[PDB]
């Protein structure tokens with residue numbers, strides 16, 4: 071069995087190996103990368119996502135989200151307070167303001183300490199989930215707007231044609247902006263490219279150990295757990311590395327820098343935070359190995375998780391028993 075300790079693997083594909091995306095995901099898995107739940111891919115030196123980032127300031131963040139925390143430093147939830155629209159140029163200025171900028175620090179480890187110590191006492195503003203792409207249409211390799219669609223994958227594997235589309239999302243972050251512990255919708259893969267700016271630190275639980283995280287989370291958020299049997303789908307709960315270590319939950323951490331891809335694998339729980347102003351792009355995708363995860367994915371039917379149009383068909387085809395209850399939670 072490859073990668074039995076479930077370490078995060080880092081890959082350095084050549085330009086020739088960067089041509090066929092599906093093939094390279096399958097290669098990574100042949101080496102055990104999926105056991106970690108997350109892998110880093112450093113593109114070949116010849117590659118670029120686009121020529122420059124000099125002309126992105128007029129992109130609109132229609133609903134910036136202020137991330138307000140409640141709880142204790144290592145175990146907290148966050149809710150998202152909607153703010154007035156602002157452009158990327160306005161947002162970058164805000165990120166770099168004295169109120170929101172990254173503090174002085176020695177290294178990534180120092181900054182991580184400061185994050186876990188102080189995150190709850192501030193409410194950073196995140197431009198998340200903005201439909202769009204920053205890949206140049208002429209970038210042919212690992213262009214997140216040109217991947218094979220999940221609907222076509224389900225059709226190729228299972229023979230059923232379904233409605234729905236699959237497009238990428240932009241994330242504009244600042245210091246302390248936070249992504250709560252989650253797996254992807256329907257336990258899909260995700261891929262995330264850090265286009266520009268300051269790093270993003272990730273934490274991940276090996277898929278084979280996801281239920282240990284879930285058990286801890288039920289203990290640590292006992293009201294939430296009573297309200298919904300899949301409340302991590304709400305994407306609001308944070309648990310620090312110190313707390314996970316105290317409770318024996320297996321996990322790993324890595325920092326992504328600008329120009330690097332991260333891939334999350336089915337049922338790989340992940341969480342993290344941004345170091346300062348940045349812009350990432352991410353999209354879900356599927357492979358044949360995903361299908362069995364899709365069939366077994368938990369679902370939130372309490373009404374909180376509310377998700378895209380395209381998840382309908384996945385639930386309907388892969389989880390017909392669950393469909394009626396899940397759809398009620400959609401409506």
Ligand SMILES: O=C(O)CNC(=O)C(=O)O
Nearest residue numbers: 241249260261262350352
């Ligand atoms: O970058 C973020 O805020 C969150 N991204 C992801 O959870 C992902 O790419 O799967």
Ligand SMILES: [Mg+2]
Nearest residue numbers: 126127128129
């Ligand atoms: Mg612009």
Ligand code: NI
Nearest residue numbers: 253254260334
């Ligand atoms: Ni994710």
Ligand SMILES: [Zn+2]
Nearest residue numbers: 298370372374
């Ligand atoms: Zn729920």
